[PDB]
Amino acid sequence: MKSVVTTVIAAADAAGRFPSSSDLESVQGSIQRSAARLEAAEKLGANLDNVAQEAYNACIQKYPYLNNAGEANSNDTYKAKCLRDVKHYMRLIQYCLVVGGTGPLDEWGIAGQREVYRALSLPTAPYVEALSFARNRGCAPRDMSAQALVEYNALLDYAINSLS
């Protein structure tokens, strides 16, 4: 699961090394940056439902064709699964803020996403528009501290980049 500490352990292990000065120095980064990303994780964790709900609403608002008979937001099962998916991405982003790496999103969100959406005819633009809205929406300090918001925004951009 990619984090600061698993990245340096994997590197030390491939070289057959004990933790050395650059490994300890790396983890001090986690000690320093953890306050901002844990803050972002607490804020997102507390309000997941409303954050995902408006991102979902914004992507259906941009693409109302999805509501027509036979399109991906056209029945209450599809509607519920579309909002669930947006929530899944936001949850994995919360996990990335707790871990201080992209591991959770890489393993549980990004891996397979293109094969899944292709097979089920799910267009990617509405996924990008949900995340893009969430990316443009936050401001500091209203929603979280400035550095918390930098971490939140970076992980939304990472997700956007994975689908773009």
């Binding site: 698993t6 352990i9 004990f18 871990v99």
Partner: protein, 184 residues
């Protein structure tokens, strides 16, 4: 491989829910500097620890350095020294990460069966691991005895607290205990 943080995420993902309490994780961050000192204390002393542990296992089990002993001849002694360094290295990764994941997955998984197939003796391996557990406890607290170290004694000069990082000692010790449990 997991760390203390991805461990909480895997627990939360078993219920597809957000990580709810990060207070335990905030305490992990407040403990961070002492954890880097604890890893530094083992890594900086690792050569001294591995040679002293293997020499102790041997001084208490002289059969190992006689005909048919598993530290005889030179090739087997060398292999043993290598194994001590490997085990201590993976314990030290677990301590850096704050999770047994890397130790279990990359070192212990299948190790007992490997040793059984080779005829590496359990009691002697466990003994060497018990000595390293005691050495690490002493280097983490920064209270190594001159009696045990003679001219090789090292002091770390970390800011001293009363408990001498008893929580990290107990965690480090539990990682050594997982090796002994996996091998015995």
């Amino acid at each position: 491989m997991l760390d203390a943080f991805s461990r909480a995420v895997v627990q939360a993902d078993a219920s597809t829910s957000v990580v709810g309490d990060v207070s335990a994780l905030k305490q992990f961050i407040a403990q961070g500097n002492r954890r880097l000192d604890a890893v530094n204390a083992i890594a900086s002393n690792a050569s001294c620890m591995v040679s002293d542990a293997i020499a102790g296992m041997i001084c208490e089990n002289q059969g190992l350095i006689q005909a048919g002993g598993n530290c005889y001849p030179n090739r087997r002694m060398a292999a043993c020294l290598r194994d001590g360094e490997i085990i201590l290295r993976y314990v030290t990764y677990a301590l850096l990460a704050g999770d047994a994941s890397v130790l279990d997955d990359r070192c212990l998984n299948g190790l007992k069966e490997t040793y059984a197939a080779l005829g590496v003796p359990t009691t002697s391996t466990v003994r060497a691991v018990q000595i390293m557990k005691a050495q690490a406890a002493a280097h983490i607290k920064d209270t190594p005895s001159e009696a045990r170290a003679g001219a090789k004694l090292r002091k770390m000069g970390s800011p001293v607290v009363e408990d001498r990082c008893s929580s990290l000692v107990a965690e480090a010790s539990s990682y050594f205990d997982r090796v002994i449990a996996a091998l015995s």
